Amino acid sequence: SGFRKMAFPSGKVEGCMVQVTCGTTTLNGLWLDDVVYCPRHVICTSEDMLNPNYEDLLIRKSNHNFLVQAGNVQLRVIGHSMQNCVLKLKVDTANPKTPKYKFVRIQPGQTFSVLACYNGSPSGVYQCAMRPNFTIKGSFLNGSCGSVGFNIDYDCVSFCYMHHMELPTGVHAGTDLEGNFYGPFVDRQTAQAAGTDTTITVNVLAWLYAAVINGDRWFLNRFTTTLNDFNLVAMKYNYEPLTQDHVDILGPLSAQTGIAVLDMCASLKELLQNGMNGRTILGSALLEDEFTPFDVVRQCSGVTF
Amino acid sequence: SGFRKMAFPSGKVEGCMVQVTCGTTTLNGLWLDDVVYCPRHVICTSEDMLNPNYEDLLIRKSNHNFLVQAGNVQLRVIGHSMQNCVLKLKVDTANPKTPKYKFVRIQPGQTFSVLACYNGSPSGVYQCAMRPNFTIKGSFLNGSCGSVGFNIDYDCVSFCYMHHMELPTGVHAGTDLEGNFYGPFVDRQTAQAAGTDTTITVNVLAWLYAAVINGDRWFLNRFTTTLNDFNLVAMKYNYEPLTQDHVDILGPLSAQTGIAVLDMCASLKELLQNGMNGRTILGSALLEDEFTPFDVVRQCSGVTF
Ligand SMILES: *[C@](O)(C(=O)NC)[C@@H](C[C@@H]1CCNC1=O)NC(=O)[C@H](CC1CC1)n1cccc(NC(=O)C(C)C)c1=O
Numbered sequence: 001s002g003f004r005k006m007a008f009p010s011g012k013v014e015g016c017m018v019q020v021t022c023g024t025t026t027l028n029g030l031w032l033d034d035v036v037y038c039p040r041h042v043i044c045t046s047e048d049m050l051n052p053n054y055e056d057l058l059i060r061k062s063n064h065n066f067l068v069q070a071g072n073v074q075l076r077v078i079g080h081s082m083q084n085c086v087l088k089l090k091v092d093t094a095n096p097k098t099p100k101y102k103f104v105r106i107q108p109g110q111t112f113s114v115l116a117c118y119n120g121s122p123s124g125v126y127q128c129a130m131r132p133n134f135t136i137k138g139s140f141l142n143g144s145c146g147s148v149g150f151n152i153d154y155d156c157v158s159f160c161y162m163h164h165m166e167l168p169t170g171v172h173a174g175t176d177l178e179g180n181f182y183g184p185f186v187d188r189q190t191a192q193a194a195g196t197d198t199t200i201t202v203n204v205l206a207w208l209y210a211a212v213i214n215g216d217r218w219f220l221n222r223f224t225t226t227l228n229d230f231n232l233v234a235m236k237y238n239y240e241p242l243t244q245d246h247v248d249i250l251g252p253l254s255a256q257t258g259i260a261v262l263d264m265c266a267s268l269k270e271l272l273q274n275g276m277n278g279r280t281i282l283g284s285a286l287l288e289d290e291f292t293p294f295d296v297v298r299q300c301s302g303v304t305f
Numbered sequence: 306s307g308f309r310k311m312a313f314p315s316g317k318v319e320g321c322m323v324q325v326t327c328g329t330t331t332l333n334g335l336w337l338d339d340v341v342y343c344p345r346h347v348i349c350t351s352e353d354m355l356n357p358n359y360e361d362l363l364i365r366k367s368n369h370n371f372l373v374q375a376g377n378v379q380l381r382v383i384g385h386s387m388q389n390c391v392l393k394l395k396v397d398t399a400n401p402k403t404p405k406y407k408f409v410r411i412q413p414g415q416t417f418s419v420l421a422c423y424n425g426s427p428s429g430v431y432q433c434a435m436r437p438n439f440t441i442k443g444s445f446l447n448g449s450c451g452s453v454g455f456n457i458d459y460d461c462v463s464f465c466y467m468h469h470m471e472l473p474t475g476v477h478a479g480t481d482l483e484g485n486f487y488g489p490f491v492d493r494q495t496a497q498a499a500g501t502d503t504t505i506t507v508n509v510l511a512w513l514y515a516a517v518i519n520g521d522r523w524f525l526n527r528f529t530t531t532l533n534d535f536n537l538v539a540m541k542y543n544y545e546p547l548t549q550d551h552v553d554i555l556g557p558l559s560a561q562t563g564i565a566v567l568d569m570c571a572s573l574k575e576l577l578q579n580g581m582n583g584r585t586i587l588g589s590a591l592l593e594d595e596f597t598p599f600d601v602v603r604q605c606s607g608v609t610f
């Protein structure tokens with residue numbers, strides 16, 4: 001028992017991280033088979049940033065401009081290509097440690113582990129979620145770019161994110177591994193606002209089930225509610241509307257704990273209307289919406305990879 | 306920018322994790338060179354737990370009783386030995402992936418990453434701290450035992466913890482890698498209380514510096530205080546007394562942020578006396594004492610391993 005924020009192990013992704021230099025700018029890249037992926041903004045200077053034409057900035061580059069270092073091993077680029085906002089670099093050697101893997105585009109609310117890298121070298125690891133505004137509350141210094149977000153399904157590593165930008169708010173935007181941005185963001189140094197950051201209601205609810213399971217259950221309440229009724233109170237506290245599909249998802253928790261979904265929605269509502277009044281749940285003095293149903297399952301079942 | 310709880314990468318420790326069966330009971334062990342370390346309570350049955358004599362439970366064991374599985378590779382035990390509350394198993398093969406490593410015994414307040422394992426297989430990773438009561442707020446299901454806590458110093462992996470027990474509170478106790486328990490705990494199923502869990506003041510202060518650095522600075526206060534004065538207010542809020550050595554440690558933060566230690570101690574005091582009154586710091590609605598000065602440095606500097 002006990003409950004914490006925890007990431008999948010990094011191990012598998014560590015051996016896919018490489019350093020990529022072009023011009024001066026060096027950042028991180030990801031090496032799978034005979035391809036190294038990275039943010040295309042590696043070809044830009046601090047000036048190009050303000051309004052780059054990537055197509056045209058790229059014509060003036062050739063394979064040999066792109067230095068790719070695997071610790072000390074220098075890989076030869078024998079081809080290159082821009083896919084959306086990523087660059088794909090054909091290289092001579094295939095990665096001996098390439099795991100099973102896939103490129104996924106997660107839905108908002110979905111969580112993933114992030115291995116933060118500086119200069120191809122991984123500095124640390126943490127879990128975060130694709131916030132409803134399509135940002136993420138990460139920790140990314142300069143040099144962090146091209147670091148990635150991933151899930152693991154026993155063997156298979158799912159790549160959901162590649163890091164590109166920081167926003168005025170101290171939050172981050174980035175791409176799937178096909179290089180399309182989550183949200184409306186562009187890889188340019190222009191003014192860009194997040195949008196309204198809402199709470200992932202379904203994830204909050206699971207966090208409650210996890211609480212129950214761990215014998216933090218004081219916030220349980222005799223009241224029940226209806227779906228429509230509860231959403232009225234959600235919308236007003238800026239909570240993502242809750243669908244039938246969200247309830248479905250919370251079924252196995254619901255079953256296990258003996259607490260009906262809507263009774264848990266009742267208990268939540270009263271916490272919105274009445275705050276936490278000082279107390280803590282699982283040590284957190286606020287509500288935590290960066291845990292999927294699945295995350296909770298995993299951690300209250302002890303799954304491995 | 307941004308700030309999160311993040312662990313070192315696991316990678317290096319993953320390749321040292323193995324499964325150890327004796328009797329029925331299987332748990333995790335750690336394989337360095339030609340030795341596999343694990344909690345000695347692997348030789349016990351659910352009954353032995355209530356009051357085992359380990360010496361005598363052990364005489365009736367021999368090398369072949371101890372099954373050690375590295376994925377599928379079965380290692381041959383050619384020797385065994387009890388060190389305090391751990392068992393050391395001489396085996397035929399040395400671990401090809403053994404990194405540089407050391408056995409450390411951390412001080413209370415010190416943090417470390419934990420890679421939680423079930424059946425030699427690592428399920429996930431999180432950071433936690435040796436609480437002043439010598440417990441840790443972990444997430445450990447049955448089968449988690451022998452999972453370990455570690456730091457990394459570029460190359461060198463420092464082993465600070467091996468997991469053994471859960472306590473009535475949903476908290477955990479365990480050993481250094483020489484097998485001595487942190488705190489007064491014993492590997493037996495008897496009644497054991499944590500003791501008073503105090504807050505790691507010095508770590509809180511660094512978390513504030515990290516806040517400042519990230520432009521959460523509302524809690525900054527014109528007042529200053531004295532060391533003796535502030536401790537009076539600490540003791541009463543159950544905060545670890547603050548030494549000169551703690552101030553020393555907070556120097557480089559102090560310098561960088563331009564905020565004197567005692568001015569930060571002033572700002573803290575008022576947060577004790579006045580609560581957070583609703584607001585959040587770095588998204589946390591309480592004070593976070595599971596970040597070392599060093600942790601903060603690392604994350605606001607981008608160090609790698
Ligand atoms: C990345 O470029 C990197 O690590 N390069 C070596 C990364 C670094 C950021 C600094 C702090 N945390 C980070 O994520 N991001 C940027 O530098 C990006 C590059 C992308 C192509 C734009 N970057 C550059 C310039 C300006 C911005 N941001 C803004 O203009 C905001 C005001 C919206 C930016 O994100």
Ligand SMILES: *[C@](O)(C(=O)NC)[C@@H](C[C@@H]1CCNC1=O)NC(=O)[C@H](CC1CC1)n1cccc(NC(=O)C(C)C)c1=O
Nearest residue numbers: 001346445446447448449450469470471492493494495
């Ligand atoms: C560990 O034994 C394991 O994983 N074995 C396969 C581990 C499992 C715990 C269950 C939930 N989280 C855990 O950490 N710990 C125990 O089972 C320990 C073993 C040590 C030798 C005692 N254990 C066994 C029996 C009873 C207790 N605890 C208590 O009696 C408390 C009431 C103090 C215990 O920790």
